[PDB]
Amino acid sequence: MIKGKQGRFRQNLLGKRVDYSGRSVITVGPYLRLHQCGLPKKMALELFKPFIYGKLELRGLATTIKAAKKMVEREEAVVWDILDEVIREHPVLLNRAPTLHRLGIQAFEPVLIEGKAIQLHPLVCAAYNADFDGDQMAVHVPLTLEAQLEARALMMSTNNILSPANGEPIIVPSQDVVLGLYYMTRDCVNAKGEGMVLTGPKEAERLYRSGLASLHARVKVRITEYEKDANGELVAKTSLKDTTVGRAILWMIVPKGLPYSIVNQALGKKAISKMLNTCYRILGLKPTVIFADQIMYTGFAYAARSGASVGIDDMVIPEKKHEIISEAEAEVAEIQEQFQSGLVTAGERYNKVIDIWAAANDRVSKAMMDNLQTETVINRDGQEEKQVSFNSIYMMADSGARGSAAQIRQLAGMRGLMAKPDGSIIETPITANFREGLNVLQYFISTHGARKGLADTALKTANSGYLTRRLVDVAQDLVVTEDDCGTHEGIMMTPVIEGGDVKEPLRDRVLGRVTAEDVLKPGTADILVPRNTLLHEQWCDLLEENSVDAVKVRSVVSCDTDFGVCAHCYGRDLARGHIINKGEAIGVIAAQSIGEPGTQLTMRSSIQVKNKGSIKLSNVKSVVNSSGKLVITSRNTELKLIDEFGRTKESYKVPYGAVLAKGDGEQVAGGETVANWDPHTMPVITEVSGFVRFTDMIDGQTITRQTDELTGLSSLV
Amino acid sequence: VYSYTEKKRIRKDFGKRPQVLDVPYLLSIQLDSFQKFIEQDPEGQYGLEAAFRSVFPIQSYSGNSELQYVSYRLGEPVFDVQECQIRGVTYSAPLRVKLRLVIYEREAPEGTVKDIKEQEVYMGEIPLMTDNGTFVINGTERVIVSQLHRSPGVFFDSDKGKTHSSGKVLYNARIIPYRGSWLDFEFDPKDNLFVRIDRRRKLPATIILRALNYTTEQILDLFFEKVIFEIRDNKLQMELVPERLRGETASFDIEANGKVYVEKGRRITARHIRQLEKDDVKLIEVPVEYIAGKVVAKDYIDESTGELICAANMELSLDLLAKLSQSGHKRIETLFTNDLDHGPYISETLRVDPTNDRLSALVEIYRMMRPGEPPTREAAESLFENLFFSEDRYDLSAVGRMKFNRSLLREEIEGSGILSKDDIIDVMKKLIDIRNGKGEVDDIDHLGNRRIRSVGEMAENQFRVGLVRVERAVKERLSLGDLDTLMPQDMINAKPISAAVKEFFGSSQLSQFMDQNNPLSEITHKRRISALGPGGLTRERAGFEVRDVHPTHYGRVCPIETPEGPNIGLINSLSVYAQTNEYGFLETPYRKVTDGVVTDEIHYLSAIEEGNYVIAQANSNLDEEGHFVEDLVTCRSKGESSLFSRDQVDYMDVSTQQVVSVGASLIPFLEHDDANRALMGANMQRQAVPTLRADKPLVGTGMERAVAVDSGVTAVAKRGGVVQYVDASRIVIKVNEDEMYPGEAGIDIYNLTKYTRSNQNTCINQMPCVSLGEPVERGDVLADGPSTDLGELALGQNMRVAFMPWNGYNFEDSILVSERVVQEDRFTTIHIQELACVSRDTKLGPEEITADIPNVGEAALSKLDESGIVYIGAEVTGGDILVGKVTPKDSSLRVPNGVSGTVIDVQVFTRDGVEKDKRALEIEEMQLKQAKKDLSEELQILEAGLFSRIRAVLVAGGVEAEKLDKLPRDRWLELGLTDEEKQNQLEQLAEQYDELKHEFEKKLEAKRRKITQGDDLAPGVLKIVKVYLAVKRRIQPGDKMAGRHGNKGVISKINPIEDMPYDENGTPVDIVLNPLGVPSRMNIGQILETHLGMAAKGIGDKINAMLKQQQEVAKLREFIQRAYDLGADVRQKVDLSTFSDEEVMRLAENLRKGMPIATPVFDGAKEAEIKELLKLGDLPTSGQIRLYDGRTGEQFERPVTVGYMYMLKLNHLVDDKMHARSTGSYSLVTQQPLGGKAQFGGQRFGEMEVWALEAYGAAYTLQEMLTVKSDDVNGRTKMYKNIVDGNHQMEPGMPESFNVLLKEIRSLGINIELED
RNA sequence: GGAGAGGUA
Ligand SMILES: [Mg+2]
Ligand SMILES: [Zn+2]
Q: Are A19 and B1224 in contact (CB under 8 A)?
A: yes
Rounded to 10 deg, the angle between the A321-340 and A346-373 helix axes is: 170
A97 CB closer than 7 A to any strand C atom = yes
Q: Which residue in A28, A180, A447 is closest to B560 by CB distance?
A: A447
Give Cα A304 distance to the centre of its chain.
28
Close Cβ partners of B836 (under 8 Å, ≥ 6 residues apart): B1024, B1025, B1026, B1027
Question: B1183: closest CA among B903, B802, B873, B904?
Answer: B802
Query: What is the C-alpha separation between B1214 and B1209, in angstroms, rounded?
Result: 12
Write out the H or E segment, with its range, that includes residue B834. strand B829-838
Are A310 and B803 inside 8 Å of each other by CB? yes
From CA A83, how far away is CA A55, in angstroms rounded? 9
Phi, psi of B308, rounded to the nearest 5 degrees: -60, 125
Pick from A20, A306, A397: which is nearest to B1198 by CB?
A: A306
Q: Which of B808, B1053, B1288 is facing A176, going by the closest CB pair? A: B808
The integer distance in angstroms from the CA atom of A53 to the C1' atom of C7 is 40
The number of beta carbons lying within 10 Å of the beta carbon of residue B355 is 17
Q: Is the CB of B911 under 7 A from strand C?
A: no
The answer to whether the Cβ–Cβ distance between B814 and A28 falls below 8 Å is yes
Please write down the HEC assignment for all residues of B557-588: ECCCCCCCCCCCCCCCEECCCCEECCCCCEEE
Q: Are strands B183-187 and B170-176 parallel, antiparallel or unpaired?
A: antiparallel
Q: In the sheet that B829-838 helps form, which strands lie side by side, from edge to edge?
A: B829-838, B1023-1033, B902-910
The contacts of residue A596 (CB under 8 Å, 6+ apart) are A100, A101, A165, A468
Q: At what angle do helices A269-283 and A286-306 cross, to 10 degrees?
A: 160
Give the Å distance between the CA of A569 and the centre of ligand 2: 4
Measured torsion, CA atoms of residues A302, A306, A308, A314, in degrees rounded to the nearest 10: -140
Please report the beta strands in B302-424, taking only residues with DSSP state E, as ranges in sequence order: 308-310, 331-335
How far does A82 lie from chain B, in Å, by closest CA? 15
CB A50 within 8 A of CB B1280: yes
Interatomic CA distance for residues A636 and A625, integer angstroms = 20
Longest CA pairwise span in chain B (Å): 131
Interface test with A, best of B640, B1221, B1226, B1304 (most A CBs within 10 A): B1221
Phi and psi, residue B476, nearest 5°: -65, -30
Contact B97, B73 (CB under 8 A): yes
Distance between CA atoms of residues B774 and B721, nearest Å? 9
CA B684 to chain centroid? 19
Q: By C-alpha distance, which of A160, A158, A157 is closest to A168?
A: A160
DSSP conformation letters of A117-183: SEE--TTHHHHHT--SSS-EEEEE---SHHHHHHIIIIIBGGG--B-TTSSSBS----SSHHHHHHH
Which H or E run includes B1203?
strand B1195-1209
Enumerate residues 6+ apart whose C-beta is below 8 A from B1184: A309, A311, A313, B1199, B1200, B1201, B1202
Q: After which residues is chain B broken (C to N over 2.5 A)?
A: 889
All residues at 6 or more sequence positions from B1118 whose CB lies less than 8 Å from its CB, including other chains: none
Question: Is A279 within any annotated ligand binding site?
Answer: no
Rounded CA-CA distance B590/B461 in Å is 35
* Contact predicate B221/B333, CB 8 Å: no
E-strand stretches of B610-758: 615-616, 633-636, 641-644, 651-652, 699-700, 715-716, 721-726, 730-735, 748-751, 756-757
The spacing between the Cα labelled CA in A418 and the C1' in C9, in angstroms, equals 30
Question: CA–C1' distance B760–C6 (Å)?
Answer: 13
Distance CA A355, CA A350 (A): 9
Residue A91 makes CB contacts below 8 A (sequence gap 6+) with A107, A108, A109, A110, A142, A148, A151, A152, A155, A156
Residue A63 CB burial class (10 angstroms; 0-12, 13-18, ≥19): exposed
Find out whether A313 is annotated in a ligand binding site: no
What is the signed CA dihedral for A248, A251, A253, A257, rounded to 10 degrees?
-160
CATH code: domain of residue A631? 2.40.50.100
**What resolution does the deposited structure have, in angstroms?**
4.3
**Ligand in nearest proximity to the CA of B1040:** 1
Distance CA B169, CA B163 (A): 8
**Residue A219 and residue A242 in contact, taking contact as beta carbons nearer than 8 Å:** yes
The answer to whether the C-beta of A4 is closer than 7 A to strand C is no
Known binder of ligand: residue A37?
no
**Statement: the CB of A133 is under 7 Å from strand C:** yes
| Cβ pair A540, A133 in contact under 8 A | no
Under a CB-based contact definition with an 8 Å cutoff, are residues B1225 and B1241 in contact?
yes
Backbone dihedral angles phi then psi of residue B1049, each to the nearest 5 degrees: -170, 165
Q: How was this structure determined?
A: cryo-EM
d(CA A276, CA A270) in angstroms, rounded, equals 10
- Ion ligand 1 residue ranges (Cβ < 5 Å): A 131, 133, 135
Amino acid identity of A359?
Answer: A
Out of A40, A99, A307, closest to residue B1248 by CB: A99
Using C1' positions and the CA of B686, the closest nucleotide is C7
Domain of A363, CATH number, reads 1.10.132.30
Q: By CA distance, what is B1307's nearest residue in A? A: A1
**Rounded distance from Cα B1238 to ligand 1 centre (Å):** 24
Cα–Cα distance for residue pair B1274/B637, rounded to 1 Å: 77
For chain B, give me the number of helices (H) and strands (E)? 34, 57
Residue whose C-alpha is closest to residue B907's, from B810, B828, B1025, B803:
B1025
Helix (H) or strand (E) holding B65: strand B65-74
Considering only residues 1043-1062 of protein chain B, which place a Cβ less than 7 A from any atom of strand C? 1048
Residues ≥6 apart with Cβ < 8 Å to A578: A572
Q: Residue B821 burial by CB count (10 A; 0-12/13-18/19+): exposed, middle or buried?
A: buried
Domain limits for position A318? 312-454
- How deeply is B755 buried, as exposed, middle or buried, from its count of CB atoms within 10 A (0-12, 13-18, 19+)? middle
Yes or no, beta carbons of B1265 and A9 under 8 Å apart: no
User: Annotation-wise, does A188 bind a ligand?
Assistant: no
**Distance to chain B for A44, nearest Cα, Å:** 9
Strand C bases contacted by the protein (CB, 7 Å): 1, 3-9
Largest CA distance in chain A: 119
End-to-end CA distance of chain A: 71
Å: B570 CA to C6 C1': 14
The strand pairing partners of A107, in sequence order, are A93, A156
Rg (CA), chain A: 34
Contact A239, A222 (CB under 8 A): yes
Cβ-Cβ contacts under 8 Å for A525 (sequence gap 6 or more): none
Element (H, E) at B124: strand B115-127
Reference A153, options A63, A198, A62, A91; nearest CA is: A91
Output the CA A565–ligand 2 centroid distance in Å.
5
**A138 CA to C4 C1', in Å?**
28
- Contact of A668 with A613, CB cutoff 8 Å: yes
Burial class of residue B1288, CB neighbours in 10 A (0-12, 13-18, 19+) = middle
Rounded distance between C-alpha atoms, residue A460 and residue B738, angstroms: 66
Ramachandran region, residue A428 (left: φ > 0; alpha: ψ -120 to 50; beta: rest): beta
**Pick from B1224, B1256, B1295: CB nearest A154:** B1256
Long-range contacts from B1284-1291, C-beta under 8 angstroms, 24+ separation: B1284/A50, B1284/A53, B1284/A54, B1284/A57, B1284/A65, B1285/A54, B1286/A54, B1286/A58, B1288/A143, B1288/A144, B1288/A145, B1289/A144, B1289/A145, B1290/A143, B1290/A144, B1290/B1264
Kindly tell me the sign of the dihedral angle through the C-alpha atoms of A143, A148, A154, A160. positive
A242 by DSSP, 3-state: which?
Answer: strand
- Sign of the torsion formed by the C-alpha atoms of B338, B342, B343 and B349: negative
Cα-Cα end-to-end distance for chain B? 97
Residue B332 near residue B228 (C-beta atoms within 8 A): yes
Q: Distance between alpha carbon B642 and the CA centroid of its chain, in Å?
A: 34
Q: Are the CB atoms for B198 and B182 separated by under 8 Å?
A: yes
- What is d(CA B47, CA B34) in angstroms, rounded to the nearest whole number? 9
